[PDB]
Structure formats: C-alpha cells, structure tokens
Amino acid sequence: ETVPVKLKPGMDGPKVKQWPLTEEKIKALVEICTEMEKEGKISKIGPENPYNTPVFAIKKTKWRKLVDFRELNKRTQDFPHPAGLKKKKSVTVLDVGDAYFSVPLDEDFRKYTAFTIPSINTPGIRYQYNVLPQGWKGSPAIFQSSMTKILEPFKKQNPDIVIYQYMDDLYVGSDLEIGQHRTKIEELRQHLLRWGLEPPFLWMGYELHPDKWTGYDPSKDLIAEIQKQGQGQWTYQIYQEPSKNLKTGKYARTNDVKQLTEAVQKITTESIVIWGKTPKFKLPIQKETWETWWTEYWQATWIPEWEFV
C-alpha cells in the first residue's frame, strides 16, 4: 500500500531549471541513475512532463547524488524533536538515505519528482521517481513508522542513546566515553545492515560534541544571518524576530565561498540538532558568485533555503 500525497492547494509542481555541470559530475550521475533505473527506483520520461528539479553530485572515489528538492518541498502538503540531543557529549551523524528506496511513491505524485541529467552536448536525460526520494520532505514522514520498528530493538537495549532522523541523516547521541560511543555507532550500523539497509556512505561518521556549543515557536521559521569579519572569520546569529536571538557563534577557516559554505553547513547542523529545522539564511555574498561555487564545497545531504544580503 502507498500513501496518497497532494501538493498544497493553489500550487503547481516545480519547474526549476537544471544548472550546468562539469563533465565529471554528469558521468557520475549517469552511472548512479543507470543503476537506480535498473533497480526500478526511477524511470525515464519525455517532455510530456513539464516539471523539473535540479540535481547535482557531491563528494564527502565515490560521488553522491543530491537532488535539490527545496521547491518541491515548499509545494508539498504538510504531514518529534528530542530536547536532549543537544545535551549529549557526542552526536554522530550517519547517512542512511538509501533507506527510502524500498517504499513506492504514490503513482499520482511521481510526475512532480522529475529531474534532468544535463549533457555536455541535446537536452539531457529526464527521470522521475517511483519510490520515496532522498531529500523530499514526505519521505521521512511516510517512512517514519517503518524506521521506528527498525530502531526499536536497538533503542530498547540502549535506553540512554538518543536517535533523531532528519531527512537522510541519523543523529545518534550518547554520553558514553568516546571510544565506547564510537563502538556503539558501529553496533548501530551493523544493526541497520541486518535489517536490510545497505547505504554506501554509512561507514563514515561525522562527530559533533554539542555540549560544548555556545523562546522558540515551532510554527515560526528560523532565520540565520552571517557577517564576514576577517582572516577567515565569520559571525552568525539565529533568530525568529530580528532582536530576539536564539544562538550566536563564530566559524573560523581557501576562498570566501568555501568558508561561507562550511559555515552554512555548520550552522544548519546546529539548528537541526537544537530545534530540528533548517534555518533560512541571509548570505553576505553576491548571488552569482555563490551560485558559481557553492556546490564545489557542499558535503551535506540537505540544502537550506537562502537569500543574499
């Protein structure tokens, strides 16, 4: 059985142009998509489908596909965050996005997930999803019940570990001694493999220590500003009303966009840990300079919204 999904009343699906990619990124995307197609997760389509969402490829040997569903997400219907996560000595971020590929996507909604692998030449290759896609806000919401069953035996044996999922990421928090924390993360990886997950980047662990980090309305949106200082030094604030800050910080570095891009990722990760939401950024940089370079330094599996200022 599949979950029926609608766009928000009054909205059509996304029609976002694919941006130019290097020959190397295209090659990688073609191999990834060929295998997804073989595996039935996507299907080729033609120009009868008017929708489109951008795709590119990142490196964290192996490229990873990254579909920029920011517009589709804004257009999709609406469907818990642990307060203790930010309190844990260590939080390790795992990538598990391959998990969504086992659940079919409402046949009526598939057309809206269309994307285009550009070509060096010709228009390029168009596909749409048949299965819950990575990066789409409905996929965790539909899969939520199944991931609870998968995690439940592990949570039962480890009641003091906090596990929180945001999109493709699992955030796993413990107060254990660092060696023991890391060994428990491997135990969780192996638990997931025994339940069928085979995510190619699961082996990596991105390690946070939020207890060492520096009035919130869930309905409200989080906003982040960033200011360039100097010699690789940036400052930021997260708020909801410009005066009433919820967090402030500094990131320290090479070029600016690369540093700004790392700062944006770091700030978003903190927001996800603290509140479970990505903020909307006000970026101190020119649109065209940002757009030329940010994908060269992006390593996250999500993408926040941004504006330029």
Author numbering: 6 to 65, 69 to 87, 95 to 136, 139 to 214, 224 to 240, 318 to 356, 362 to 417
Excerpt from the paper describing this PDB structure:
Formation of active HIV-1 reverse transcriptase (RT) proceeds via a structural maturation process that involves subdomain rearrangements and formation of an asymmetric p66/p66′ homodimer. The viral RNA codes for a p66 protein that forms an asymmetric homodimer in which the RNase H domain in one subunit becomes destabilized, leading to subsequent unfolding and proteolysis in order to form the active p66/p51 heterodimer. We utilized the isolated polymerase domain, p51, rather than p66, since the initial subdomain rearrangements are largely limited to this domain. Two different fingers/palm/connection (FPC) subdomain constructs containing the same interfaces that are present in the monomers and in the p51 subunit of the RT heterodimer were investigated using both NMR spectroscopy and X-ray crystallography.
The globular fingers, palm, and connection subdomains of FPC1 overlay well with those of both the p51 subunit of RT and the p51 monomer. Similar structural agreements were obtained using the FPC2 structure. Although crystal structures were obtained for both FPC1 and FPC2, the FPC constructs did not crystallize readily, perhaps due to the dynamic behavior of several loops.
